[PDB]
């Protein structure tokens, strides 16, 4: 038995604001003791293993192998401040899937079954993926990842990135559907690494850039190198020879809470300088924004060799 509460904390701020919001939710729980929301009343009685929050919805996991989704939106005039959806949509259960782990992505969700299958479906639509040609295959990227014949034991997710570790100690990483033009660099299929000594992968966590795995007595991180290290390498490559980036190079950013892919108009000379970018709309693959220099990735991978940002 439990009760569900919501709170909103504006991102640029200090820990004091977070503590103040937690204080407010505690006071609401104690001083006033407001009634529970009927839409989540059923979910209150059920135990919870994990919960994830998407860009616009939230997904709850059950100990009985059940996953549910609900809609939320935060209004600025009232800034519970979160207005929830009128109705909650469950997971269509066939043959008792009995999921284990869940994760949230910008364009979809991710689930792991008891046998292990990356069940997923987008936030826009309302049905789990159903391949007509292969009714036993879900997550059309599953074959490309190479996880269609393995037992998934750990899953981790962020807005754009996802990673899965199987029982065979193989870590497979990829990005979201929106970020596809850069997938040639950030994606590794199912593969065992000699860095992992073969012990049971205790935990896997990831962020918008890289991913860290916790073993029994070690932490191993991989992905994009930190921006401070990127700047250090850039200043230790061009300057030591005594046009950092050519124009028209594509990249992606997670600025303002939305991952967007765009090109750069002019070459960058000073790394700390903020450069304008030309937005590349997702529909254009099938307007002008001055992106922050630090959040840009420069995925184009553009005398000794150029330092690698990966």
What is the experimental resolution, given in Å to one decimal place? 2.7
Residue 151, both tokens: 């037992």
Alpha carbons 257 and 255: distance in angstroms, whole number: 5
Q: What DSSP character marks residue 32? A: I
Alpha carbons 180 and 282: distance in angstroms, whole number: 10
Q: What is each CA distance from 163 to 90, 177, 208, in whole angstroms? A: 24, 14, 11
> Are 212 and 221 in contact, with CB atoms under 8 Å apart?
yes
Number of helical H runs and strand E runs in the chain? 6, 18
Residues facing residue 130 across a β-bridge: none
Alpha carbons 95 and 87: distance in angstroms, whole number: 25
Q: Scanning the structure block, which residue is given the tokens 């935060």?
A: 74
Q: State whether the Cα torsion 100-46-106-211 is positive or negative.
A: negative
Alpha carbons 217 and 250: distance in angstroms, whole number: 39
Q: Scanning the structure block, which residue is given the tokens 């939305």?
A: 258
Where does 69-170 have alpha helices with state H? 142-145
> Are 122 and 108 in contact, with CB atoms under 8 Å apart?
yes
How was this structure obtained? cryo-EM
Residue 27, both tokens: 């006071």
Alpha carbons 62 and 157: distance in angstroms, whole number: 18
Residues facing residue 219 across a β-bridge: 214
| CA dihedral of residues 303, 297, 261, 274 (deg, nearest 10) | -90
Broken C–N links (> 2.5 Å) in the chain, after residues: 79, 242, 286, 302
Q: Which is nearest to 304 in space by CA: 233, 251, 209, 245?
A: 233
**Phi and psi for 71 in degrees, rounded to 5?**
-100, 140
**Phi and psi for 259 in degrees, rounded to 5?**
-75, 120
> Are 235 and 260 in contact, with CB atoms under 8 Å apart?
no
Strand residues in the chain grouped as ranges (E): 48-53, 57-62, 67-74, 82-84, 89-90, 101-104, 109-112, 118-119, 152-157, 161-166, 171-175, 203-206, 210-214, 219-223, 250-253, 260-264, 277-279, 288-289
Q: What DSSP character marks residue 272? A: T
User: What DSSP letter does each residue of 65-85 carry, written as one string?
Assistant: S-EEEEEEEE-SS----EEEP
SS3 state of residue 156 = strand
Rounded to whole angstroms, the maximal C-alpha distance in the chain is 70
Alpha carbons 121 and 109: distance in angstroms, whole number: 6
Q: What is the DSSP pairing of strand 260-264 with strand 219-223?
A: unpaired
SS3 state of residue 194 = coil
146: left (phi over 0), alpha (psi -120 to 50) or beta: left
Residues whose CB falls within 8 Å of the CB of residue 300, separated by 6 or more in sequence, listed in order: 245, 249, 250, 251
């Amino acid at each position: 038995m439990t009760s569900i509460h919501f709170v909103v904390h504006p991102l640029p701020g200090t820990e004091d604001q977070l503590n103040d919001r937690l204080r407010e939710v505690s006071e609401k729980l104690n001083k006033y003791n407001l009634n529970s929301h009927p839409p989540l009343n059923v979910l209150e009685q059920a135990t919870i293993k994990q919960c994830v929050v998407g860009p616009n919805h939230a997904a709850f996991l059950l100990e009985d192998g059940r996953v549910c989704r609900i809609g939320f939106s935060v209004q600025p005039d009232r800034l519970s401040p979160v207005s929830l959806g009128e109705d909650l949509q469950w997971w269509p259960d066939k043959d008792g899937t009995k999921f284990i782990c869940i994760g949230a992505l910008y364009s979809e969700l991710l689930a792991v079954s008891s046998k292990g299958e990356l069940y997923q479906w987008k936030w826009s639509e309302s049905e789990p993926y159903r391949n007509a040609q292969n009714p036993s295959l879900h997550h059309p990227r599953a074959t490309f990842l190479g996880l269609t014949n393995e037992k998934i034991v750990l899953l981790s997710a962020n807005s754009i990135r996802a990673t899965v570790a199987t029982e065979n100690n193989k870590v497979a990483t990829w990005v979201d559907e929106t970020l596809s033009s850069v997938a040639s660099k950030l994606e590794h299929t199912a593969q065992t690494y000699s860095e992992l000594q073969g012990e049971r992968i205790v935990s896997l966590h990831c962020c918008a850039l890289y991913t860290c795995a916790q073993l029994e007595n070690s932490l191993y991180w991989w992905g994009v190198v930190p921006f401070s290290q990127r700047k250090k390498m850039l200043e230790k490559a061009r300057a030591k020879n005594k046009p950092l980036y050519h124009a028209g190079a594509v990249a992606f950013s997670i600025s303002a809470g939305i991952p967007k892919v765009g090109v750069l108009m002019e070459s960058v000379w000073n790394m700390n300088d903020s450069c304008r970018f030309q937005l590349r709309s997702p529909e254009s693959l099938k307007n002008e924004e001055q992106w922050s220099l630090r959040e840009v990735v420069f995925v184009e991978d553009v005398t000794p060799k150029v330092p690698d940002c990966f």
